[PDB]
Every structure is written in C-alpha cells, then in structure tokens.
C-alpha cells in the first residue's frame, strides 16, 4: 500500500500534476477480498461504473489512515462515497508476484463522441436505443425461464462450406428467415 501510493505520486509529480490536484483513490478489495487472477477485472468494472455515474466509492473499512500516507499529497483516501460533477479519466494498477507491474488508463465516452459528426452520432443513438429494447426483453425472458445462457450446437455453416468460409474473408452469415438462426447462406460465396 505504501509502495503503490509512492509510485502513483511519483508518476503524477514527474509529469507535473498541479499541486493540490489530488486523485481520488479506490480500494475495492476491502469489500470483495482478493480474487487473484480476476482482480483487475472487478477494478476495471468499478471504474467504468464511476465514469458512468460520477460517483467515486470509498473504503468503508478505512477507520484510520496510516500516517505514512500523509506524504502522498497527490492522493485522497476516501472512507465514504463522493459524488462529483463528472469524471474524465481513471487509472488502474496492479503488482503481481514475480515483479509484474501492470497499469491501464480509461477515458470517458463523451470524448469519443466528440470526434463524430452529429448525424453519425444520432444514427448510433438510434441503433443503441433499438438494441436496448431488444436486450431488455431478451433478458427478462431468459431470467424468468432460467435460460439467460443458451448454448450452440451446430456451426453457422456446414461441413462443405467449412473450408470455403475459412477461405472467403467476405463470407458473412444472414439471418435465416424460417428459423431465425444466423447461418452462412448456401450462396455466401
């Protein structure tokens, strides 16, 4: 905990983060424990939810912050959740056994949308909206019937098509209008 706080402060300082501009620290393992190989995923999922809500969760087990952490001025250690007016970017870090340090940086989706034109944006809106309705519906159906998961059996192709699908990179399925399945149509070539 000391080493990681030092590393983050050193990164921020040496890139010239403005004094007083401290990052809000998240410490999820107080709540979930440590699921070793899964760990970063939960942390990443939480950071995506932070981007979505503007809410930064706190470490409820942080009863007294270690005095050695006071020197890490670029970090705040919250013990309760803090609502902000939005989050632009987050960092995730990990220190695996065998000296494996790992780090990743996420940015808020608005910055991507700000690279499109308004029409392209609105068309995307349309699709995600339609899809959302379909998803909500499917979800309830699977839930009520204990069938969210539903495994495949057949390939979308057949054993003659097999190699040819493997060799025509423009091969695409269609929805079969009789079964509703997605299949490589017999004339896909």
């Amino acid at each position: 905990d000391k080493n990681e706080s030092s590393v983050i402060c050193q990164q921020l300082a040496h890139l010239g983060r403005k004094k007083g501009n401290a990052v809000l620290g998240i410490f999820q393992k107080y709540l979930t424990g440590h699921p070793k190989g899964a760990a970063g995923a939960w942390m990443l999922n939480g950071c995506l939810q932070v981007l979505n809500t503007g809410l930064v969760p706190g470490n409820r087990n942080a009863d007294n912050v270690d005095k050695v952490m006071e020197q890490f001025d670029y970090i705040v250690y919250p013990n309760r959740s803090i609502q902000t007016d939005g989050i632009k970017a987050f960092s995730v870090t990990s220190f695996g056994f065998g000296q494996k340090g790992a780090q990743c940086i996420g940015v808020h989706p608005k910055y991507l949308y700000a690279t499109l034109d308004e029409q392209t944006y609105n068309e995307y809106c349309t699709k995600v909206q339609a899809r959302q309705k379909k998803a909500y519906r499917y979800f309830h159906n699977g839930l009520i019937n204990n069938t969210l998961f539903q495994a495949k059996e057949k390939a979308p192709y057949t054993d003659e098509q097999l190699s040819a699908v493997l060799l025509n990179p423009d091969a695409r399925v269609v929805e079969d209008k009789k079964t509703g399945q997605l299949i490589f149509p017999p004339n896909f070539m």
């Binding site: 004094k19 401290a22 009863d63 007294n64 005095k67 007016d85």
Partner: protein, 518 residues
Amino acid sequence: RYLKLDIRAGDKAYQASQESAKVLQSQLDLWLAEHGDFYASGIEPVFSPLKARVYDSSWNWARQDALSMYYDIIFGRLKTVDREIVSQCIRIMNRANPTLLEFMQYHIDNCPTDRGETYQLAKELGAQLIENCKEVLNANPVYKDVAIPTGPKTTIDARGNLKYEEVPRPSCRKLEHYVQQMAAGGKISEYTIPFLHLRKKSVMGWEYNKKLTSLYLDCLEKAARDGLTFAGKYALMTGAGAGSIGAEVLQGLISGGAHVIVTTSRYSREVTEYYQSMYSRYGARGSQLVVVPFNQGSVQDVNALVEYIYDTKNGLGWDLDYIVPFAAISEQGRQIDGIDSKSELAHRIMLTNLIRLLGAVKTQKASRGYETRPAQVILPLSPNHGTFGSDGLYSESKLGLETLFNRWESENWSNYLTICGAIIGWTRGTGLMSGNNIVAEAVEKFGVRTFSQQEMAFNLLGLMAPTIVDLCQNEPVCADLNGGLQFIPNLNELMTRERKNLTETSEIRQAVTKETAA
C-alpha cells in the same frame, strides 16, 4: 498379581477427583449466596490492549470534508450560509494544514464560474474559507459551538396524542445569550443566584460564591465568543456512550485538540464505528482518540487501564491532565426493599471503583515523581439526595463522592490530583433521564432550567478552562450546574402530578376520537 497390575487403582484416583469437585463446588455456593448473578457477571474484566482503536488521521478527513462541501454547493444542496456550514467551516479550520490549503486553492482557482450561479458561489465561499484557514494555520484548534440552545416542548395533538421535541428557545439564539441567561438566574433563585454558580466551602458548608461564579461565567462568555483549546491535554473519559453527556464532552475535547482515551463496556463494530464517525467529524489537528474495552466494575480492569495509560513501552505513555469518570448504571425502580446485586454493582462502579481509579492514577504519578502535574478531576455529583426516589443506591454513591472534597485537604494526594465537583442538574435526552423528558417543559415553567446534552457539555468544558484549573490547584471547586432544581419543594410529587396532567388531557381527546369513530 504376577504382573503387579490393578484396575481398581484407576477408580481410586477418580474418587479423589470427586472430592476435588465437591470441595471447589461448596465455595461457589458460598460466594453466590452473598453476591448474585448480576454482580458476578458485572465484575468480570474485559480490558484488552489488543482491542485498542486509535484515530488520528484528521488530515485526510479535512480534504474529504472540503471536497464534499465544494460539491454540495455545486449541486445546490448548500445555498445559504447557515450555522451548519459555519460549523463545518470551523471544523475545517481546526484541521487546517499547508497541504489542505494547496488542495482547496487548486479547486477554487479552477472552479468554472461560467457553468452557473452555484459554481460562482462555490468560488466565493471557498476563497473566504481559504483565507480563514490561513489565519488559523498557526493557531491551536478551538472548540467553538454554534448550535442553538434548545428547550423541551411536549405537545398533545387535537386527537389527544403526545410528542416530545427539543425546540429552539425564542430568547436564546447564541451561547453568549445562554451565558447571559444563566448569569441572570430566575424568579425561583431570587434572594438573584445565577443558574450556574460556584460554591465555596464555609464553616457551615458549601455556600454560593459571587467572585468564583464571576470567574466561571467569564470563562463561559469567553468560551462562547473565542472558543476553548485543549491542545496538548490528556483526558481519560468513562461513560461517553451514544446520547450521553460524555459524548458531547468528547466532541468538545477532540475539537479542541485533546488526546482522549475513552472507555466502553460494550465493544462491538457498531460502537467502534460510532467513535470513528465522531472522530472523522470532530477530530482536530493534533487530536487523538483511543477507544478501549473497559468494565468499571472490575478492579483488574481499573488497574489494567491505568497501567496501559502510563506504560511507556507497551502502553500510551501519557500523563493525565483530566479525568471524567462519568460511567453510571440506571437503578430506576429500586426502593429500600429492592436493593439487589445490580444496586451493589452500580454502587461499586459509581463510588468504590471510581475511588480506586483515582488511587491508581495517584500511584503512577507518585511512583514517577510528576508532582507538578496534578490532574483535574471533574467529579460528577448529583442534586438528587433521595428526592427523586426509587433509584437504588444512586444517591448514596453520589453523596459518597462529596467526601473527596475533604479528603483532598486531609490526605497526601493533593500534589497529584485536584477536585472539581460538578452538581449536574436535569439534562434532557440522556439514558438516565429520557423517561422524564415529557414533563421537563412543565418543570421549567416553575422557573428552573433544564439542560440539553449540548448545554451541559458546554458548561462542563468551561470547568476545564485554564482559569478554573488554576483555581482547582488552590482549593477544591464545587460547581452547581443544577439550574435551580434545589429550590423546588416536593419535586417527585410535582413530577407525578404533571405526568398525570398530560395523560388526562390526552385521554379525553382520545376517548372523544375513539367514540367519534365508533
């Protein structure tokens, strides 16, 4: 026989063991026959240094609170400078440090005022708070209370239904006005004697002393205006649970910068979270809160607590400036025929082990020669000398404490301790008096003052002010904080009558309501 073996020997040893059992059993029987289960269980040791919780990270909570306040203004949750904001500003000021100033300055310098009135307001109020924090950066933290002094109000609705509430007093908007009212007294204290006053030992007993009273009232007036600092003071507190006077006194001490060890007879996560939340809110720069399990019924816990406080290797290594031994058990419903094992335990906690706790502190101070640091004992006395009735050995315990006044002069421990006996009057909302809250409004109409936990805590912290501590080194101080209840004849009969008066009125409206329904 050829092998020199025998089975019966095993049984012989077993029989001897029966005798061991019967021997020991008899003694338990004899013990229990003179003590009772409530006593037996109430005296077991629970003190453990491993279970100590220490809170000192006020620097981190200051940044969190400053940021929370910034966003609460932005979201329009905070629109007007109310006393709650002023109180929060005082708490941030008491925690001010250079890193916090840099942190606040960054947010205010980069506040986007173009986004609306709330951002502009956040910038203006933040700049004012930054400047206030710079002014107090090198000043010691001070306890300064900005809440409104309340009074009891008991209402019966039109249907006949009772509700108790603490309401702001129309005549008292600030603690300065409160001190003025306390100094003025009431019609019931006309020869006026102030509702809060100091007594001096005379040949005929403890009498009202105008000079000492003026010193204490001046301390309270200064405390109301300028605040009280306890920076670099060490305090031992017993009886600071939720809804106690001790909890409010604890808030004052840690906000003034004290190092406080607080004791609990029930150690659990919820209790530690309560104290944690108190420290996160009220802890100042350089204050420290230590929470430990402690049973004031056990001589061993008493010894172990005092040893842990004084031990420099495995303990806190402190030296105490103050003692607030306010632990108490409710004995309500016990008359002369009902003095039980619980009354013995209550008496032991409130009198016998309190005296031992003091003796243990003396022993440490004497053994290490700290003769120029006598501790002030705020000694919790009661105006109830059996006048409430049906309260077990409570009156006897409180009267028994009064003897310490004389013992300070007649024994050889004055060099290590000094006594400040507070006669604590009726304090509303406490676990000992909550059942009487409904009649407190009626009692005040007779011209006496009842107190909120806040008001009483403010009075007590005033006894810890430097001028009073110096006085205690001259002579034991007796502080009458009773609010004039001693001038009401037959308090129990009056209380019983008013409790009836409420009930009748309530019942009549309820009967009419119920009949109207039928």
